[PDB]
């Protein structure tokens, strides 16, 4: 399959700036808040909701499939499921979304 053109253009930069992180900045970059200390369910191996591996905050584990399975395949790209709150997108997003 031809890889989708990720329209997030490679950020051109020649300078690296560092500094203290404001709480407002952390809230702006964060995709959600983590309430429960549980990581996954030991039986179904699915991530617990609002956990350290939750799919509503960090992204779906399976490509183009929501947590509850209501929406599947690429045809629902960009849609957030009303039942589980998980966006239908690539698994690669689980490397960039921050809580």
Partner 1 sequence: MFTNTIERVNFASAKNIPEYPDFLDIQIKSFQDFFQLETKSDERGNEGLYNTFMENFPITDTRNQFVLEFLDYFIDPPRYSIQECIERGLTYSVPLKARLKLYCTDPEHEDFETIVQDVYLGTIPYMTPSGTFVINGAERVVVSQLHRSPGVFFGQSFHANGTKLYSARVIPFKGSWIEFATDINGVMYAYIDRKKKLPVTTLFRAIGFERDKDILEIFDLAQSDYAIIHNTLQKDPTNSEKEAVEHIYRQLRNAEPPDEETARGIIEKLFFSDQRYSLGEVGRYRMNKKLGLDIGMDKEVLTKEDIITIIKYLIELINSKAEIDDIDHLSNRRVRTVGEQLSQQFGVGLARMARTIRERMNVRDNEVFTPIDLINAKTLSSVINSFFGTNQLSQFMDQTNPLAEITHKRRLSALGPGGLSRERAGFEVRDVHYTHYGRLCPIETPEGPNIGLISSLSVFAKVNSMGFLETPYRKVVDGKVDVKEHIYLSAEEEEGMKIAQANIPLKDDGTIDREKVIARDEGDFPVVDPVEINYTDVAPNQIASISASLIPFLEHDDANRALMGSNMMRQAVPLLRPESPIVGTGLERQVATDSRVLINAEGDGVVEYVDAQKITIKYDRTEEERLVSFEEDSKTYELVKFRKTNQGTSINLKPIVRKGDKVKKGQVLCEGYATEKGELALGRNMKVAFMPWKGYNFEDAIVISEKVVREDIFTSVHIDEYALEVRDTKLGAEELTNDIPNVSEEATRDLDEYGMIRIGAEVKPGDILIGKITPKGESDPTPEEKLLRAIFGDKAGDVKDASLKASPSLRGVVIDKKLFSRSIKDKRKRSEDKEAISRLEMDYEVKFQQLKDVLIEKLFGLVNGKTSQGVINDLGEEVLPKGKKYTIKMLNAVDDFAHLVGGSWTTDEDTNALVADLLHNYKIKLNDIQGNLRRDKFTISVGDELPAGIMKLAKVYIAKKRKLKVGDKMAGRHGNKGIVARIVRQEDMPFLEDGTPVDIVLNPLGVPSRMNIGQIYETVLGWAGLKLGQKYGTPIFDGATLDDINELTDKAGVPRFGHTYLYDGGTGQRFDQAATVGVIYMLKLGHMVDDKMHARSIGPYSLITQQPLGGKAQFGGQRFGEMEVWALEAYGASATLREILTVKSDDVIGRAKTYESIVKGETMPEPGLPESFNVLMHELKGLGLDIRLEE
Annotated binding site for Zn(2+): 66, 68, 81, 84
Six-digit token string for 3: 């890889």
Rule CB under 8 A: which of 37-66 touch partner 1?
Answer: 45
Distance CA 55, CA 44 (A): 14
Among 33, 36, 39, 72, binds partner 1 (CB under 8 A): 72
Span of 3-11, 33-41, 48-56, 81-89 interacting with partner 1 by CB under 8 A:
3-11
Beta carbons of 67 and 48 less than 8 angstroms apart: no
- Measured from the Cβ of residue 54, the count of other Cβ atoms closer than 10 Å reads 24
Six-digit token string for 11: 């950020």
Task: State the residues that interact with partner 1 by CB under 8 A.
Answer: 2-3, 6, 10-22, 25-26, 29, 45, 72-73, 92, 95-96, 98
């Amino acid at each position: 399959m031809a890889r989708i053109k990720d329209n997030n253009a490679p950020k051109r930069f020649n300078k690296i700036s560092i500094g203290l992180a404001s709480p407002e900045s952390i809230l702006a970059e964060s995709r959600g808040e983590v309430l429960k200390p549980e990581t996954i369910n030991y039986r179904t191996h699915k991530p617990e909701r609002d956990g350290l591996f939750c799919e509503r905050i960090f992204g779906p584990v399976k490509d183009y499939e929501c947590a509850c399975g209501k929406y599947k395949r690429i045809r629902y790209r960009g849609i957030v499921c009303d039942r589980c709150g998980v966006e239908v997108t690539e698994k690669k997003v689980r490397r960039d979304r921050v809580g």
